[PDB]
Amino acid sequence: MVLSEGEWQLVLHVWAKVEADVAGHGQDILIRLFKSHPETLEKFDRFKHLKTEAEMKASEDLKKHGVTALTALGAILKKKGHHEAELKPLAQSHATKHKIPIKYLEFISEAIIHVLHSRHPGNFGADAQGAMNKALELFRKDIAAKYKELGYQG
Ligand code: HEM
Numbered sequence: 001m002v003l004s005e006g007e008w009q010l011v012l013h014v015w016a017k018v019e020a021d022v023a024g025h026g027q028d029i030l031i032r033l034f035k036s037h038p039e040t041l042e043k044f045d046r047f048k049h050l051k052t053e054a055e056m057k058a059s060e061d062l063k064k065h066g067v068t069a070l071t072a073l074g075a076i077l078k079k080k081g082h083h084e085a086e087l088k089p090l091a092q093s094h095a096t097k098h099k100i101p102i103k104y105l106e107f108i109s110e111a112i113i114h115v116l117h118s119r120h121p122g123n124f125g126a127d128a129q130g131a132m133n134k135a136l137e138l139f140r141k142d143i144a145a146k147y148k149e150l151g152y153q154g
Pocket residue numbers: 040041043044045046065068069070072073089090093094098100104105108
């Protein structure tokens with residue numbers, strides 16, 4: 001797929017608001033993911049012991065990981081589709097070290113979209129949400145093709 005420049009603009013305009021507080025957004029998103037789909041927490045050996053949302057909120061580690069994850073995504077989105085180099089090391093570790101099925105990349109995409117909708121309603125109307133969704137679908141499609149070259153998904 002290919003996003004138009006107007007679609008990238010909408011994606012990068014809400015992302016600039018996320019960057020005003022990366023750690024806060026990274027915490028919200030990972031928590032939304034774990035609550036919604038608790039099986040995804042089992043992939044994290046570091047965090048699988050966390051029992052409640054209050055424990056999650058208080059985990060410094062968890063918040064440090066959310067910053068790491070978001071920063072990597074942000075770097076991919078700012079490429080506006082030319083992200084081949086960035087995607088390689090990410091597809092290699094998620095496919096052969098962590099073993100994250102595409103399905104889970106779909107659940108986190110849903111969590112990213114829930115949180116932006118809640119926090120940034122004025123900058124995340126229907127067109128901006130469709131543009132974010134296309135960007136995350138592109139990301140997932142390229143990752144999936146890389147998983148296949150790497151010997152992991154299907
Ligand atoms: C927006 C999509 C995602 C991004 C951009 C992302 C990014 C990252 C980055 C930058 C790291 C550190 C370096 C590395 O190991 O490659 C990481 C580690 C990891 N990721 Fe992801 N990730 C994403 C989706 C997920 C999902 C959906 C899961 C699991 C349900 C997952 C599970 C993990 C695990 C288990 C690690 C290791 C954490 C630790 O022990 O240090 N990732 N990810």
